[PDB]
């Protein structure tokens, strides 16, 4: 790390002089709580048929979406105190903060 600098690096390296990858790109996320995987270390809940989570069957994500999230679009309630720009700034901002890569097909 340069001992003086004037501008940010593109990768975010050197923002924190004591731990110069912190906030830099292509690094692991910090964990605020320890991960919870079916085998402790890698497999996600729902991977293995019949394996319960903390005593209970794992609900299919699509079942939860069907039963709790689904609603009739005509019931939509416009927010009298927020614009759609409030949604859109959120997405743009998310795209300044995080992108979690996946392998290609």
């Amino acid at each position: 790390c340069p001992e003086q600098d004037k501008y940010r690096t593109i990768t975010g390296m050197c923002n924190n002089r004591r731990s110069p990858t912190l906030g830099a790109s292509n690094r692991a996320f910090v964990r605020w709580l320890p991960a919870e995987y079916e085998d402790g270390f890698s497999l996600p809940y729902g991977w293995t048929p019949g394996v319960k989570r903390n005593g209970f069957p794992v609900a299919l994500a699509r079942a939860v979406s069907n039963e709790i999230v689904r609603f009739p679009t005509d019931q939509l309630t416009p927010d009298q105190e927020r614009s759609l720009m409030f949604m859109q700034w959120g997405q743009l901002l998310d795209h300044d903060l995080d992108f979690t890569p996946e392998p290609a097909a």
Binding site: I10, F29, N54, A59, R62, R82, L84, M87, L92
Partner: protein
């Protein structure tokens, strides 16, 4: 191949289909899903973690890139003017569009064969996902070039690198200002804003500025704000005929709409003058994203809420009560207790029927189910997670706009005058815009003002 197969083999983790699904009748089908890349592939030692490809900082990396080759490629290296590259084929009534990308399997080309308009190239790879997002990217590209142009007139001896860097610094600061002054108070509400984002003091080099794994899922609260149409309005803020309300399932990757259906002005007007959707407990997220996400470009429509839940599992995130505990909030154990937390026994019972215990409710689902804080748009759990993350991004950023040494005092005073409505005035053909706060203002003409009433950024203190 996770896109075409329903086999569960790494790296695929397809979503299985329940019986009596309203859309997908074949239970041997699936919704495609690739597991997030592991930080340490193939390890029998590490607890699997995922990777952030971007800079965590609020630094406008979505405009400039987070990797050096991309960052160089986004620049106009034809001259010493410090500009970002612009589209060489099309303009939006004389104003710049983003350059085109060169992708092997370009999804934007699929949305309209005859238009042949590819995806845009920006600092982040998702810039063409919806034209409203493209419009914001384009607005920031223009603002960069506007500032570099003004700085060259002010400082004719500055070279290209200096111009690029000084305009980049300003654009980063504007993103920080808009975000922390205008946007976050309206997400969190006043009490949570005071709790999690107390008045800034100065940079603290012991604050870890990384994005937490949980925040990648929690900040998806915004999916509950999404309306089922893209709204386009003309210069009277009236519906722009003949297709003023396009279903969202025909706008994903539809870069052709920006190029051939009127540019960014009608889209930005639509954003200012249309309400967001309100999150209610029995109106959580719309079917344009729950049933038809990316339907044009893929073998089957995705379910974004379902993807959020599968993703939290992919990432090993603890369930709802563990996060409540992390936040210092009471953890409901019975349906009665969950009903109290939700002010809603009906929803508590539905959740318990799916999950068995509130220990197992996926973080996105539990977070978006909670009643909203006063004058905020998240509940207490999401407020804690989001507010905690943004405090770290502020206090742990050596280049935070208020930190001494980043800008001069005079530059800070000038920056404090910026607003998103003024940025829109400066870089588009729009002449009437939302009153501050832009994120609250939503009804034309009540909440609208002419551009001439808004102070413009004074660059005098950048003269050397």
């Amino acid at each position: 191949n996770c896109e075409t197969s329903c086999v569960q083999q790494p790296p695929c983790f397809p979503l299985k289909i329940p019986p009596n699904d309203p859309r997908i009748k074949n239970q041997a089908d699936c919704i495609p899903f690739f597991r997030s890349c592991p930080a340490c592939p193939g390890s029998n030692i590490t607890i699997r973690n995922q990777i952030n490809a971007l800079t965590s900082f609020v630094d406008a990396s979505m405009v400039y890139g987070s990797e050096e080759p991309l960052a160089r490629n986004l620049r106009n290296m034809s001259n010493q003017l410090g500009l970002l590259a612009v589209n060489q084929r099309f303009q939006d009534n004389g104003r710049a569009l983003l350059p085109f990308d060169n992708l092997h399997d370009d999804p934007c080309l699929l949305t309209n064969r005859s238009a042949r308009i590819p995806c845009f190239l920006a600092g982040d790879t998702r810039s063409s996902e919806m034209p409203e997002l493209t419009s914001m990217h384009t607005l920031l590209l223009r603002e960069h070039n506007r500032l570099a142009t003004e700085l060259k007139s002010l400082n004719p001896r500055w070279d290209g690198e200096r111009l690029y860097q000084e305009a980049r610094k300003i654009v980063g600061a504007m993103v920080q200002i808009i975000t922390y002054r205008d946007y976050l108070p309206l997400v969190l509400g006043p009490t949570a804003m005071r709790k999690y984002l107390p008045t800034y003091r100065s940079y603290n080099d012991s604050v870890d500025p990384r994005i937490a794994n949980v925040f990648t899922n929690a900040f998806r609260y915004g999916h509950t704000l999404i309306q089922p149409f893209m709204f386009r309005l003309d210069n009277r803020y009236q519906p722009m005929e003949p297709n003023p309300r396009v279903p969202l399932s025909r706008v994903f990757f539809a870069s052709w709409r920006v190029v051939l259906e009127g540019g960014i002005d009608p889209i930005l007007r639509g954003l200012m003058a249309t309400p967001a959707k309100l999150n209610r407990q029995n109106q959580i997220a719309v079917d344009e994203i729950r049933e038809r996400l990316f339907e044009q470009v893929m073998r089957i429509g995705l379910d974004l809420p379902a993807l959020n839940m599968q993703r939290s599992r992919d990432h090993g995130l603890p369930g709802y009560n563990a996060w409540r505990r992390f936040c210092g909030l009471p953890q409901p154990e019975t349906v009665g207790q969950l009903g109290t937390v939700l002010r809603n026994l009906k929803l508590a019972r539905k959740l318990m029927e799916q999950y068995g215990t509130p220990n197992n409710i996926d973080i996105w689902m539990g977070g978006v189910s909670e009643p909203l804080k006063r004058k905020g748009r998240v509940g207490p759990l999401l407020a804690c997670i989001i507010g905690t993350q943004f405090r770290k991004l502020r206090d742990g950023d050596r280049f935070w706009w208020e930190n001494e040494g980043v800008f001069s005092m005079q530059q800070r005073q000038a920056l404090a005058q910026i607003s998103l409505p003024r940025i829109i005035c400066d870089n588009t053909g729009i002449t009437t815009v939302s009153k501050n706060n832009i994120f609250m203002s939503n009804s034309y003409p009540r909440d609208f003002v002419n551009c001439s009433t808004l102070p413009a950024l004074n660059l005098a203190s950048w003269r050397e």
